[PDB]
Amino acid sequence: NSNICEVCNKWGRLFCCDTCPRSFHEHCHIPSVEANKNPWSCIFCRIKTIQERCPESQSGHQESEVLMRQMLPEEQLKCEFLLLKVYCDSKSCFFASEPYYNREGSQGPQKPMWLNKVKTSLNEQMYTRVEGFVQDMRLIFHNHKEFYREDKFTRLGIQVQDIFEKNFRNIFAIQETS
Numbered sequence: 001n002s003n004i005c006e007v008c009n010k011w012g013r014l015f016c017c018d019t020c021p022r023s024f025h026e027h028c029h030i031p032s033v034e035a036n037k038n039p040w041s042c043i044f045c046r047i048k049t050i051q052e053r054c055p056e057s058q059s060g061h062q063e064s065e066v067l068m069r070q071m072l073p074e075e076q077l078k079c080e081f082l083l084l085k086v087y088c089d090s091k092s093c094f095f096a097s098e099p100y101y102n103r104e105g106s107q108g109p110q111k112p113m114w115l116n117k118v119k120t121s122l123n124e125q126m127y128t129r130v131e132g133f134v135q136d137m138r139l140i141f142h143n144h145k146e147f148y149r150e151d152k153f154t155r156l157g158i159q160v161q162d163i164f165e166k167n168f169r170n171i172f173a174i175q176e177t178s
């Protein structure tokens, strides 16, 4: 196994996957690394199994169909994995915890949103469709772009949204387009 967390790239108290060489801090893995279970398989491994069991699940899909899917166990997992792929980028730090808004010439968003809030919402099974999860993720970046206006810091929101969107297209096998 690797000697650093796959998500945050630090050493520490690491749990090792049994079916691949990745390792995780307990609360870096999503869902949080399960108490017992030997062997244990990480989210990466679980997602690869879904694909292998249903190879056709990689054929292209329309986003509108994906968003309307109910949050059954496989869709729950895919959203957890997509959330985790965002936290894998170090720039996710800016969007992880609850924000506050006091900048001359801007007003804060009507509906603040942050990664740890989405993480809790997933854990508590608060989303009934993929659309709920995707809307909250996209709201994070949209709030950031609107608030920061012409400050160059707006770019961090574009950057992390691009990581989200690429991974959304991969994980949910969205049909490729120009």
Ligand SMILES: [Zn+2]
Pocket: 005, 006, 007, 008, 009, 010, 024, 025, 028
């Ligand atoms: Zn970690």
Ligand SMILES: [Zn+2]
Pocket: 017, 018, 019, 020, 021, 022, 041, 042, 043, 044, 045
């Ligand atoms: Zn694994």
Ligand SMILES: [Zn+2]
Pocket: 053, 054, 055, 056
């Ligand atoms: Zn099949």
